[PDB]
Amino acid sequence: DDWRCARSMHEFSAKDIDGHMVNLDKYRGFVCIVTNVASQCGKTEVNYTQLVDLHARYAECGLRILAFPCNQFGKQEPGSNEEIKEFAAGYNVKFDMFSKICVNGDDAHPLWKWMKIQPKGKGILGNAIKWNFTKFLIDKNGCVVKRYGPMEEPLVIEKDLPHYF
């Protein structure tokens, strides 16, 4: 801990994909999609393409996307942070890529521990992240407002975004 007593994403920090620690309070005022990514997953193509699309169309409105690579699901993110950064560049990613983390278990990044216990962050059949490309929608105050599973393509989130802009 003491992650459980945090009241906002803005209380957390994480290393970006270039190794620089980022204070997530930079996202105050912005609506964020926080998602765990993988390069060798059947969901990879639709998720990266649609996240890039949403970012292009809504960055000016206040949309930010934080992508956390994670190798806990089928070993579908085996590469280095440098390789993952290159992979993301092939999709023309302009949103924020982070260093690889765990999202489940005792070594999960504390932001992810925290998101999973928020009233709108809880899961079905337990809170654990079930596969690559789970998405949490975070409001301008850093609060979890919705969670979307691996099979819910990012464009499903689009109809929910105006409420938070």
From Swiss-Prot:
As annotated in Swiss-Prot or TrEMBL, what is the tissue specificity of this protein?
Present primarily in testis. Expressed in platelets (at protein level).
Could you tell me the superkingdom of the organism this chain comes from? Eukaryota
One cellular component (GO) term of this entry: cytosol
Per the record, the GO terms for biological process are: apoptotic process; arachidonate metabolic process; cerebellum development; chromatin organization; dendrite development; lipoxygenase pathway; long-chain fatty acid biosynthetic process; multicellular organism growth
Residues forming the catalytic site: C41
Positions bearing Phosphoserine: S8
Q: EC annotation?
A: 1.11.1.12, 1.11.1.9
Any GO molecular function: selenium binding
Which reaction does this chain catalyze? a hydroperoxy polyunsaturated fatty acid + 2 glutathione = a hydroxy polyunsaturated fatty acid + glutathione disulfide + H2O; 2 glutathione + H2O2 = glutathione disulfide + 2 H2O; tert-butyl hydroperoxide + 2 glutathione = tert-butanol + glutathione disulfide + H2O; cumene hydroperoxide + 2 glutathione = 2-phenylpropan-2-ol + glutathione disulfide + H2O
Q: Does the keyword Transmembrane apply?
A: no
Quaternary structure, per UniProt, is: Monomer. Has a tendency to form higher mass oligomers. Interacts with FUNDC1; this interaction promotes GPX4 recruitment into mitochondria through TOM/TIM complex where it is degraded by mitophagy.
Q: Which disease is it linked to?
A: Spondylometaphyseal dysplasia, Sedaghatian type: A form of spondylometaphyseal dysplasia, a group of short stature disorders distinguished by abnormalities in the vertebrae and the metaphyses of the tubular bones. SMDS is a neonatal lethal form characterized by severe metaphyseal chondrodysplasia with mild limb shortening, platyspondyly, cardiac conduction defects, and central nervous system abnormalities.
Q: What does this protein do?
A: Essential antioxidant peroxidase that directly reduces phospholipid hydroperoxide even if they are incorporated in membranes and lipoproteins. Can also reduce cholesterol hydroperoxide and thymine hydroperoxide. Plays a key role in protecting cells from oxidative damage by preventing membrane lipid peroxidation. Required to prevent cells from ferroptosis, a non-apoptotic cell death resulting from an iron-dependent accumulation of lipid reactive oxygen species.
Assigned protein family: Belongs to the glutathione peroxidase family.
Q: What is this protein called?
A: Phospholipid hydroperoxide glutathione peroxidase GPX4
This protein's gene is called GPX4
